[PDB]
Amino acid sequence: VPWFPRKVSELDKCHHLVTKFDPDLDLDHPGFSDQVYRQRRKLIAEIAFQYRHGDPIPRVEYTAEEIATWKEVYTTLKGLYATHACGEHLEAFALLERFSGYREDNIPQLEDVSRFLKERTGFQLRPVAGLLSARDFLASLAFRVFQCTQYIRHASSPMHSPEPDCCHELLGHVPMLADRTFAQFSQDIGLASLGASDEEIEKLSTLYWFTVEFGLCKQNGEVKAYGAGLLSSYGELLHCLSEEPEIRAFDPEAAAVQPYQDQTYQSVYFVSESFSDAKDKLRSYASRIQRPFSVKFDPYTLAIDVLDSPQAVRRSLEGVQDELDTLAHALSAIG
Amino acid sequence: VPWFPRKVSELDKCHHLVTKFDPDLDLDHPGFSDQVYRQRRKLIAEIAFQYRHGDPIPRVEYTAEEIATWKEVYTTLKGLYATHACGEHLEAFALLERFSGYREDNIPQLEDVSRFLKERTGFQLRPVAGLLSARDFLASLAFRVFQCTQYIRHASSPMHSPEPDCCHELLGHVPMLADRTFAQFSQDIGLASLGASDEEIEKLSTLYWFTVEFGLCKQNGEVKAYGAGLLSSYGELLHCLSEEPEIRAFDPEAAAVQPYQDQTYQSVYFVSESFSDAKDKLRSYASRIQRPFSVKFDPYTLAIDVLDSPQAVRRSLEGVQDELDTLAHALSAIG
Amino acid sequence: VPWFPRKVSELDKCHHLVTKFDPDLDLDHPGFSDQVYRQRRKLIAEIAFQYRHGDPIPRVEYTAEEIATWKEVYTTLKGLYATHACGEHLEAFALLERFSGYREDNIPQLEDVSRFLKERTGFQLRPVAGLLSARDFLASLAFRVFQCTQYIRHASSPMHSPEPDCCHELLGHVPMLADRTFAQFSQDIGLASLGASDEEIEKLSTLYWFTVEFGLCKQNGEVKAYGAGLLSSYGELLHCLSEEPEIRAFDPEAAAVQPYQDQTYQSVYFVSESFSDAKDKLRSYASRIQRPFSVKFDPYTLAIDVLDSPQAVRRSLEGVQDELDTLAHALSAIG
Amino acid sequence: VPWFPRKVSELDKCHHLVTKFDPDLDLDHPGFSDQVYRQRRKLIAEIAFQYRHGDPIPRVEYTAEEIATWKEVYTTLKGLYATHACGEHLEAFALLERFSGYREDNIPQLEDVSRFLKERTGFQLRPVAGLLSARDFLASLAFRVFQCTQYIRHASSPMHSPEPDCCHELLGHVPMLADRTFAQFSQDIGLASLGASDEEIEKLSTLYWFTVEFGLCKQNGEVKAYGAGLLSSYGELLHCLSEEPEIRAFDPEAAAVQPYQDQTYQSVYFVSESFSDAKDKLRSYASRIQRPFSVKFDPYTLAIDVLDSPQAVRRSLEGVQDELDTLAHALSAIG
Amino acid sequence: SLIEDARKEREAAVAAAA
Amino acid sequence: SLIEDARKEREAAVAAAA
Amino acid sequence: SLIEDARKEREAAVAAAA
Amino acid sequence: SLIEDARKEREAAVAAAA
Ligand SMILES: NCCc1ccc(O)c(O)c1
Ligand SMILES: NCCc1ccc(O)c(O)c1
Ligand SMILES: NCCc1ccc(O)c(O)c1
Ligand SMILES: NCCc1ccc(O)c(O)c1
Ligand SMILES: [Fe+3]
Ligand SMILES: [Fe+3]
Ligand SMILES: [Fe+3]
Ligand SMILES: [Fe+3]
């Protein structure tokens, strides 16, 4: 049976011990030839690898090249976010810009943003770099923690980045992660991903790429795109809503088997009328996914407990019924 | 209507802004004449006042006098904890000593211990010093955060401390806070304390002194004391179980009105057969306590939401029913 | 505010006191000229009006004309039920024929059938005749009791009946009422109908005609019709599945406003993928329907309690949480 | 494994088929020598044995001897019910006398009373006579149906009856059965009794004799007796509250093993502060009682379903969560 | 048939209003 | 009376055992 | 110690009242 | 990118099998 962590404690320990000295090459990618970019990657790797769970996120200074790119991307993308964006995304940056400091002239840090997300939506960011496997990334998603990188895309191609960077995750992902319903929907995916077999890991991971990175929804009577990739690429932002690419109703099985492409735009899209429809369907899909047990999350301790015996189920149930009694007394007091 | 904080954000901000430059005198107390003790108090105050929510707890070095006192108290108290102690207390330090490093020769720090408690029981410690009011202390208890001080008792009276210090809270309180059922019981008190009137604050606070600092229970067929004060004073440790002091069944109203004494041992004791009996009784007592609304805690964001309208109740209810459906699917998958 | 009954006690009393001597004319309808038919109507009315709640259903003997019609309709309809029927409908009569005695040569009674439905699905039939208003019929539906008539259609038109009779309800309705999910779905409609305003009564009633009497569903990969009218008329049975009539996805608002016709086939159809989709949508529709209170049903006493104050909500909640604790203990015992 | 019925259908069938021609002798008992009493017993047996589930209770006429005894007992007991009675008992007969017709000069029937109890508390009475075994009696209690006899005690000893009769059950039991909380408490006993082993049947049955027939409670600041036997015997009515008999706190194990006596007053009494305390304690006791499965009751169909697999648990859970959603929507609509 | 019931209920309700 | 019922059930159950 | 806290809270609250 | 991850996980898992 595949091994999976049980809580954040082993996640940092085992993952930071077995893995070591794994620098990224990315030579064939556009740019990545200047020695400065290699130094930044080394700086990010040392900050990431040596980081321990629960410690504050180290601050990283930014030179002119990255700040200038942030200003250009922020100004261009911000002027287009009025269209093709989703309701939660709009107020997402609106509050963030007023509080997190999102501006073209001012690129925010990680510690300040991480505090804001955890305080509001209970989300924390792990500044990881290099290659990320599937199980570890999904496991982090289960704990409601999103892996992130400190460096940004190469200045050679400001419009698009061959590999995900800070700006891509910050723009495409951060506004969506702020959504409470979406946050819970993402968390369920992580829990389901835990303990998934080799094929199952691919199956569940396939939905993320076709749902999180690229996604469509119909709210307020108009269709909008919520996928991080759709809102991250200016060219893809117009293309996603364009009728040229294929658009189909969201389907778990279809997305997990639908063929994909790399280094190219996307023509196959899945659209969900409401996020809740995706939520329960995945949970039903997860139930359909064979597993010798289940999984539960405890926010009181940020721990994960296996669900394989009735006694464990009763343990959680007892706490559940306690809340109802507390709420019932509150209802009696009120009115 | 009395003002109360809604989340940790304002708790640190408003409390650290209105309050300022409030050193402790404690001159008439035994000792407190050496300039060194005053310097330590100033060091603790500066570390405490300048601390911000979410930051790591600064490490404080210990000289010989405090470490020697820790060794003596640890050795003497540890040899007596085999009796008069409660079941949860025993394994409390047993795991802590193996992991937290509790030993007479080695006095642990705050950052390491704080991490352990939050990871297991989701508890965090705020290194506060000086005088603590009632509402703020209860409000912190509501958020499951326990206020603590860095300095220890005066070396003049190692057996007992005129004022609570690190050793008192660490020994009397920390083992009890580690209890899951007790942790939830303490949390309910904090929630009830929130918004309590002047008299109500006293009433709810009265139970804490007669229940948390001093408490008795009957488990495994023998009576044991769980109050922090009972397990903190060697003389009171024998006195509490002694038949000389008055012992009575736990009663919310009786404790909240029962007369008290200071700078002297305790003769009136309240004993609860089980912690759950205390839990529901207080919740019923809280329901009896008039309040224009209710209060709820969200572990996903560590936030507190007022309970005054059905819409807010439905908001929590929707999440509650979602958990049952998730658990129901897990049950279907299992077996 | 419109008056509504609170339990079965007043339902029988007030309805059987205010209403009296209300014979049906039905002269312009096909047949209804023979004195025998008028005598049967009088016999049904006297049995119906004088009946009291909780009493056994009086047995009514059948002559050759009705039994012969039952044999013809049963034989013809039974040979076609293999197609256009729904899964629950199939086993519905299969068990009924084996137990209730459904056969062309043997027409069952009401007392035996009523016992079977209540025992399995907790449904009881009230042998009512004459004109039935909207509020009373919906109120009966709320209590899970279905009004029924003893006499059957006129022998002049065995294929179709200008007015509903025993055979229509027995074939079109009885198999569907046996469905547990459908039974609960129908019950929710009755509860929502209670207290509905004049326009609201029409709105909720409109869904019944477009959903219960005529309905479509997609199960097992094929589309089948569950409406009583669709399965009651041989000509309409083929027409309903035919592509000539308009077919549209089920919509509460659309059905409640969609124009209707009488004494003619139906061309507008609403299809629901699953019964649960209809269930929650109506409940959401009911929530959308303004009402100064809510309504709840108590199977332990077959009573209906208004839902206008939190205290009433808590009353039901306390019983709800008791069941979870009982189930939780059962789970602990098992395994 | 012991056989147990699953619903009322087999309860009547198998019990009325295996058992047959089982008249009662009761010759050594006081009286029972007049031929008239034997004829009444035969009349009761024929009415009881031939009765079928769901049929109306046949009316039985009363001569002068029984009506005169009813008047004497009613007048004497009614004048003493002002003391030693419990709160629910008081209003129990008060409503019954106003509605059920409870009076010394007028002895009510069974059909009218049975309708009243089922309508309010959902209780039905089975007019059974002769010897009643343990499993069948407990099984009936599980379905919330109370076995009863039509004949009354012998006129030779109006003060006390050597064997239970209609007056004993009507006075001692009927007022208590009307209590909603007590009704549910009694129902839980029946469910637990189902499937109990030979020793377990005795153990659970022992609590009934020491709790239902004889019971004490402390409400409104005074101690009152709720046991049917205590409120049925005038001499025992004063004796039960008297200090001469032993009085002890209610204990499941103690009652199930505590020695008993027959044809004599009772000196050992169990007192429960509140009915709920008895309720949960028995449920915990039932959980302690080994059983390869659990049991659940469905009021919608008055059926009993075994609880041995998670799938069955989920089936009930799905309905449970549906109620919360319906209630949640009702809460949203209100206010 | 529901059409007739809807109007019948509406006219009956409004009959007393006037 | 329950005493007699308890023994009656026990003896009846054990009667077939022997 | 709670005794002093109770009076301290009460006197502080009532101090502004007068 | 998930395509490469899926194959990478599959080949890594099956590499030890052979
Ligand atoms: N495509 C590289 C892997 C990856 C996975 C998820 C992301 O959100 C992301 O930006 C990048
Ligand atoms: N007595 C000073 C106030 C105080 C309150 C609670 C404690 O646990 C404690 O150690 C001290
Ligand atoms: N159309 C007459 C009224 C009516 C309403 C509902 C029915 O199911 C039915 O058979 C008849
Ligand atoms: N003692 C005979 C058996 C019996 C059991 C329960 C009763 O309530 C009752 O009146 C009689
Ligand atoms: Fe991405
Ligand atoms: Fe303390
Ligand atoms: Fe019909
Ligand atoms: Fe009795």
Author numbering:
A (entry chain A), B (entry chain B), C (entry chain F), D (entry chain D): 163 to 497
E (entry chain H), F (entry chain E), G (entry chain G), H (entry chain C): 40 to 57
Question: Which statements did the authors publish about this structure?
Answer:
Tyrosine hydroxylase (TH) catalyzes the rate-limiting step in the biosynthesis of dopamine (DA) and other catecholamines, and its dysfunction leads to DA deficiency and parkinsonisms. We used Cryo-EM to determine the structures of full-length human TH without and with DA, and the structure of S40 phosphorylated TH, complemented with biophysical and biochemical characterizations and molecular dynamics simulations.
To further confirm the presence of an α-helix in the 39–58 region of the N-terminal regulatory domain, we performed the 3D reconstruction of a mutant with the first 35 residues deleted (THNΔ35). A total of 13,213 movies were acquired at the Diamond Light Source (DLS) electron Bio-Imaging Centre (eBIC), and 1,626,575 particles were automatically selected and subjected to 2D and 3D classification as described for the two other 3D reconstructions. Moreover, truncation studies of the N-terminal residues have shown that absolute removal of DA inhibition requires deletion of residues ≥ 3931.
